[PDB]
Every structure is written in structure tokens, then in C-alpha cells.
Write a protein that binds this ligand. Structure first.
Ligand SMILES: [Cl-]
Ligand SMILES: [Cl-]
Ligand SMILES: [Cl-]
Ligand SMILES: [Cl-]
Ligand SMILES: [Cl-]
Ligand SMILES: [Cl-]
Lengths: 78, 78, 78, 78
């Protein structure tokens, strides 16, 4: 006649399902957060590569202008 | 002149300042993303603890009702 | 004449490349951290899906055994 | 009596505890991953601040050496 074990066991099964649903929603939101992290890191990496190349380009520009000045200096009285 | 080396060098310094501002804005957005990540993990950990306790509680309920039934059975004719 | 502006400007250009190199190494390490994060979330999502299905399976098992008991009860004297 | 409903229900309660233990281990590993992520972002933010200050410092050196040159040019024949 007593259904206390069954009632308590049924409630827990119901709560287990509720928790699995909430965990899925949390995990779906975490997938969008992981996409934001990737995008953010990608933009930063693009910025870093670009600037590293821009520093090298300026180094070469000045090296070319110096070489040009050495060519000019050879025409001076010495 | 000639101001070519100086112009190229000034341009790079300018570009670097502009890029440091954009990197800071990307890093500010990434700190909010870190916060969403921590929060998500915390919610999942809370869910885990809660369910672990809920299972243990039902196991205890079951052991208590079983013990109670053994005491009830001691009143039966044997 | 005096080369103080050029020395200071050369030093900064050198530091800019040093920093771009270190930022790249930090970003490469962050790519492996984003991979560990995806993997962790995937394992959790797999666990959540599996358990959600396991709860539904038990619910159906119980439902079938309850239906079987109704059929058994129909054979009792009434 | 038949104990099939109870065996199936007991098995689910058992599996849930086992899975909660594995989820906790995954979440503990994800806490270290979140720490590596924070650390990486802080190092990048420190790099950004440092370089921004280094560029500003060179800009000020340049302006000071230019002011100094204006003062010494005032001593030239005009
Ligand atoms: Cl009865
Ligand atoms: Cl259960
Ligand atoms: Cl420079
Ligand atoms: Cl007894
Ligand atoms: Cl009937
Ligand atoms: Cl003057």
C-alpha cells in the first residue's frame, strides 16, 4: 500500500531530466562563448602578423634610403 | 630635406598607437567572454553538486524506509 | 651631427619586433587553450545527452513493466 | 515479488553518481584551462600598455630634442 519509495524515486528521475535540460542550455551558451574567444584571438593574431610585417617593411625602407645616401656620399669631396 | 626616413618612422609610431588602441578594445571584449566562461562552468559545477546530493538523499530515504519496514514486520505474526 | 633621435627611434623599432614575437607565442599558446576548452565542453555535452537518454530509457522501462503488471492483475480473482 | 522496476531505478541512480564524478573531473580540468586563458589575456594587455607607453616616451624624447635644437639654432647667424 505505501508508495513513499516510488514517489521519492519518481521525483528524483523528474529532477534528473530537468537538470540535464538546464546543463544542455548552459553548454549551448558556452559554445557561443568559445566562438567569441576564437574570433577575438584570430583578430589579435591578424593584428600581430600585420604589425610584425609593417616593422620589417620600415626596417627595409630605411635600409634602402641609407644605401641611397652611401651612393650620394661617394660624390662628396674627400 | 631629406625627411623620408623620419616620415616612414613617424608613420610606424602612429600606426602602432592606433593598433594598440584596437587591441585594447579586443582584449576588453575578451574579458567579458572570460566572465561568461567562468559563470557557465560555475553553473555546471552547481548542477553537479546538487544532483550528487539529490541522489545520496534518495539513497538515504530508501535505506530509512527499508529499516522502518523491518520494524513494522517485527509486529507481524510469525 | 647628433644621432640621439635616430638611436631612440631604432631602439623602439627593435622593441616593437620583440613584442610582436612574444605576442605571437602568447597567441599560439591561447589557440591550444581554446582547443582544450572545446574538448572539455564536448565531453560534457556527450555525458549530458547520454544521461538525458538514459533517464528516458528507464522511464520507458518502468512504463512497460507497469503495463505488464496491469496485464498480470487481469488474471487475479476479482 | 518482482524487483525489475527497483533494479532499473537503482542502476540509473548508480550511473548518475558515476557520471557526476566524471563531470566534476572534467570541470576541475576546465578551471585550469580558464586560468591559462586569463593569464594569456593579461600578458597581452601588459604588452599593449608597455608598447603604448614606449611609443609615447619616444614621441616625448623627439619633441624634447627638437625644442633643444630650436634653442641652439637661435645662436646661429641670421
Ligand atoms: Cl495493499
Ligand atoms: Cl531514479
Ligand atoms: Cl619607429
Ligand atoms: Cl523479526
Ligand atoms: Cl481487470
Ligand atoms: Cl630665432
Amino acid at each position: 500500500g505505501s508508495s513513499l519509495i516510488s514517489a521519492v524515486s519518481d521525483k528524483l528521475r523528474w529532477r534528473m531530466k530537468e537538470e540535464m535540460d538546464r546543463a544542455q542550455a548552459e553548454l549551448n551558451a558556452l559554445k557561443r562563448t568559445e566562438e567569441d574567444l576564437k574570433k577575438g584571438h584570430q583578430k589579435l593574431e591578424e593584428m600581430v602578423t600585420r604589425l610584425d610585417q609593417e616593422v620589417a617593411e620600415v626596417d627595409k625602407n630605411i635600409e634602402l634610403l641609407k644605401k641611397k645616401d652611401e651612393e650620394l656620399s661617394s660624390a662628396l669631396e674627400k
